[PDB]
Design a protein around this ligand. Structure first.
Ligand code: HEC
Ligand code: HEC
Ligand SMILES: [Zn+2]
Lengths: 136, 136
């Protein structure tokens, strides 16, 4: 019933990035610069296949410092993790949702079995609960 | 003596990102959101190891759009490419410098043998002419 810490995700495919600045609706808790990573199984779904069990997507969130009109990556704030298991995570549409504070495996952030995460990602049911799109 | 287009670089290790906004000294021509990628040979050099011939670093530069206190990736502006060959690129410190407009292999940008690129990167001689640092 727990999402596994995605060891080695920094070596995975970089899907996209985005900056969430103060005033954004997602500033608490997702403000900063984030990078989306996908393991090989998640790439199958992002390409237009079905997401296989074992697909993992990671939302890697950094603080940033605005320094002379550059936004410079600071410390890692958290990672968000979506782990595909149609049976084990059936209550949240077949994705397990977890956060890790500072990307550390012992700093679990989700306290409601991922119902809040799922509530927002449910808007993307037609794209299998995933917002990010593959770009070249 | 030409730098090879770095085919498949989007599958490589994501080193770091930064956002360069108007007012920054580098806004022309490096304004936007950029992502740095490294092949396996360049990871050896970045890790504190030495850079083998065949190491490639890519500077992947996107225009960005402001969207309600988010900065969202737009069109690719260009890629910058550094290819390691201590002997073939000896005139520019053992790295070959090339730019590809919109990341297209047909739009090579560098006209002066990479002397302009090298003039800026030469400040980083002590880190083998590479600015980027590995992070977690
Ligand atoms: C809306 C109010 C959100 C809530 C609550 C959560 N997430 Fe989210 N997530 C959201 C958006 C708009 C995006 C896309 C960002 C982009 O760069 O386009 C995301 C993305 C993710 C990802 C990457 C995969 C994807 O769907 O694009 C993951 C792994 C992710 N989110 C996990 C996650 C977890 C674990 C949450 C509860 C702690 C969570 N999200 C809440 C919007 C929203
Ligand atoms: C100073 C005025 C620069 C000139 C001219 C060029 N580059 Fe550059 N480059 C610069 C900085 C400050 C950085 C680091 C950015 C960051 O996020 O930290 C870079 C980075 C690169 C990279 C990535 C590898 C590295 O050294 O970090 C590449 C592949 C790169 N630059 C290529 C490149 C080429 C091909 C240029 C001439 C067309 C060039 N750069 C000019 C600063 C400057
Ligand atoms: Zn506003």
């Amino acid at each position: 019933t727990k999402v596994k810490y995605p060891d080695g995700f920094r070596s995975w495919y970089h899907v996209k990035s985005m900056v969430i600045q103060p005033g954004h609706p997602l500033e608490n808790p997702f403000g900063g610069i984030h990078h989306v990573y996908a393991n090989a199984e998640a790439i199958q779904g992002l390409r237009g296949g079905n997401y296989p069990d074992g697909a993992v997507l990671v939302f890697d969130l950094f603080d940033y410092q605005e320094d002379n009109h550059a936004l410079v990556e600071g410390k890692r704030k958290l990672i968000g993790v979506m782990e595909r298991d149609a049976k084990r995570f059936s209550a949240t549409g077949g994705w397990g949702y977890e956060g890790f504070g500072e990307g550390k495996p012992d700093k679990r952030l989700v306290t409601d079995g991922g119902q809040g995460c799922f509530g927002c990602h449910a808007a993307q049911k037609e794209s299998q609960y995933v917002f990010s799109r593959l770009r070249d």
